[PDB]
Symmetry: C2
Subunit: 314 residues, 2 copies
Amino acid sequence: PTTCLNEGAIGYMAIDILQSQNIETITINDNEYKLNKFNNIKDYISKVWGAASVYNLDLGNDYTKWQSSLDNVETDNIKNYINGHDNVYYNPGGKNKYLIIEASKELKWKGNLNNNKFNVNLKSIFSNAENLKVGHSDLLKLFSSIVNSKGSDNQKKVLNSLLDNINDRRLKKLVSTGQWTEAISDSVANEIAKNNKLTSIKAQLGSQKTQNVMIDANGHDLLKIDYDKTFVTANDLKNKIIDKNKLENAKNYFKIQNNDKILEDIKSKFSKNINENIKGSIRDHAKLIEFTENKKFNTINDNSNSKIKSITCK
Amino acid sequence: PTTCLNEGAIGYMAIDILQSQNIETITINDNEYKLNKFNNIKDYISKVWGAASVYNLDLGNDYTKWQSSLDNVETDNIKNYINGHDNVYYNPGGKNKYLIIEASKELKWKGNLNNNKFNVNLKSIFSNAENLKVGHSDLLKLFSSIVNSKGSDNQKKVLNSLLDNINDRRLKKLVSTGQWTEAISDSVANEIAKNNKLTSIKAQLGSQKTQNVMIDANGHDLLKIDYDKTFVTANDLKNKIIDKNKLENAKNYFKIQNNDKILEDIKSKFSKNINENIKGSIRDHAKLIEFTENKKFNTINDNSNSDSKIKSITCK
Ligand SMILES: [Cl-]
Ligand SMILES: [Cl-]
């Protein structure tokens, strides 16, 4: 919701260059994909953005302002989303699971949209994408690479600012949600935890599988707390039996550490130290941050020849 | 089948060391595991080895000779297995699949055993193993680390030799089946193929799902071949409609390259360059090769030290 038009601008930027040079197909792996043709920005945005119908922004050729337009419309939702996190459950011994940190307030977007609708379908740039076996991040990497290769010097300056913008919000959301621990190596995670006075526990975020989470215990002994007395339990939430005092506790006992010091701390070591065994919703996020941070672009070749112009990638 | 007793000996040496020092538990991932107790070599092998009953070997305290014992029983099977590979199927255009390389001859082991039975079950060293979620290779590394940390010099010299034995055969088998490509990074895989005159195709090995395979095309143009005329088809081979000349063709057109040149080439670059995206039976095979080659042991600490009601050590 906060990096989508940043991505969209990069996708348009490549299309603007390719169409400008009469290039109609791209070679991904060993297949040829035929690019769609777009009249203007409104045409492209209408095609690749889910939420295009709802907002009706007016976007110029200043791509650094594309996200800002959305940012100004939704205002507080933008910062609140980036800093937001889910409900946190802790299983101290057995058999029950307790809500130790409550989720951030629910955000209502324009049109009562859903987080999926803000996605930009980089596959809609191709007419025959249905045959494509590439994920969103690599496609973003693909279009970003085209702008670096064929873009002007000023265009590359814009691409870099856009990539940088994606990294900042994407990483921050990852730290703020507590999901950063699962996305880097155990050794580095513990170093940052040691350095930042965080406590490592085994916890569940929303409906996700249990994972490694690091929380700020706020000068508390997690051994000494009575979870039955203090907190509500996940099965209790289902029964809609809720003790307000116990629910109130989830607000005040612990927090997820997202201040600038851990944020800087992780960013220095995040890029190098991604987990060997990772997959899922989280992996795309990790793929994205790594590329936008390091900026290792793919290579683009021009296919040479009554021509149809084309280019290849890996 | 060819490195199993090499692995078993490493496990016994650790048990021998730990028991010699009255140590009953190991700490793996903030957990405590209780070691089983073994009277002798036959007691341990009978418990951790699937095939112990079948062979009934007599194993001495020269552990480097443990594998040699099994090797003499099975003889030709050892070399044939290490160099063996499965059926290779190629889908040239669209809907049909052809046998382009025939599998090696069927091997019959003693008792007509199955390759799973040759496994050394390193969790059977612990009584409370069922909550343990650690793979075979990581366990071997754990026991190897114990032999390095607490073992005598003679024992450490044996361990180095045993590890070396495991590396050589496991890697050669990985090279011989054509599966090495899936266990390393694409660029390095492409590099070795280029240096070794290999052709990269998309192929299926046995009943496995499709993957990337590199074959020696023996100076052949895979574009110019008529697979329908030349080769049998996976459906045909399965149903036993077989053309004698076509099956013969699968013997002679291409080969899987496992000679020393490529073997050395892969051995130099394999350990550093394991594939980011890897899993299956193949991944454990890769971890094992990586560890035995590099030989970077874990750290073994005595927490409770020489004097305690229960003696223990920790790891990871
Ligand atoms: Cl986002
Ligand atoms: Cl083997």
